[PDB]
């Protein structure tokens, strides 16, 4: 079985921003970066195991990369996916 | 953290920064 | 003034897309010529 290490790989990092802080303090939701595919079921399962918390629902979105102008060369940032994980009344982190 | 990006030397008519 | 070029992603792909080119041999030859010339954009696509 490889569901285990898959859950250890779908999370990538947490997202920090004033919207992220506002969501956490008001709606008790934490926004974090996830893998490219990172289906909602996998994100929910990963949050359950790693953070030993309970989640109401997970809704994701895909953030398109920006086109940046470095020197005399053009380049595009890599796309990534962020998920708004919603916790129940009881939360830890 | 990676604040330094190593900005390259720009053109003679470059943004004054 | 309606100019000649009226963009449409669907029609563009179905007329000059990769799958359209490979369907017929002549389009396959076109892809071969592009590859030999080493063009970065082999065909038109998003």
């Amino acid at each position: 079985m490889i569901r285990e290490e898959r859950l250890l790989k779908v999370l990538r990092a947490p997202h920090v921003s004033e919207k992220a802080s506002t969501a956490m303090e008001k709606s008790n939701t934490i926004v974090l970066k996830v893998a490219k595919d990172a289906t909602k079921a996998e994100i929910k399962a990963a949050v359950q195991k790693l953070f030993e918390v309970e989640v109401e629902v997970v809704n994701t979105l895909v953030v398109k990369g920006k086109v940046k102008r470095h020197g005399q060369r053009i380049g595009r940032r890599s796309d990534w996916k962020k998920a708004y994980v919603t916790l129940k009344e009881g939360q830890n982190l | 953290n990676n604040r330094p990006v190593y900005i390259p030397r720009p053109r003679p008519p470059h943004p004054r920064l | 003034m309606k100019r000649t070029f009226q963009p449409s992603v669907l029609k563009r792909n179905r007329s000059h897309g990769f799958r359209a080119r490979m369907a017929t041999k002549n389009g396959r030859q076109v892809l071969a010529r592009r590859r030999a010339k080493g063009r970065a954009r082999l065909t038109v696509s998003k």
Partner: protein, 63 residues
């Protein structure tokens, strides 16, 4: 360390592969993203270790 686990059985070597991913791999990535990971060479070391363990599993299991 490369031959230290070469004489390990599948079960125990599979376990340490599990531990390498669960601890020191997920936790390190969170620290690096949050910015409290002063030393980054751990990420390189752990990733290579996971690869080294993983290849032995394939080399041992099956062929």
């Amino acid at each position: 360390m490369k031959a230290k686990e070469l004489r390990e059985k599948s079960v125990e070597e599979l376990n340490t592969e599990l531990l390498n991913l669960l601890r020191e791999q997920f936790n390190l990535r969170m620290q690096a993203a949050s910015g409290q990971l002063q030393q980054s060479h751990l990420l390189k070391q752990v990733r290579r270790d996971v690869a080294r363990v993983k290849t032995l599993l394939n080399e041992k299991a099956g062929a």
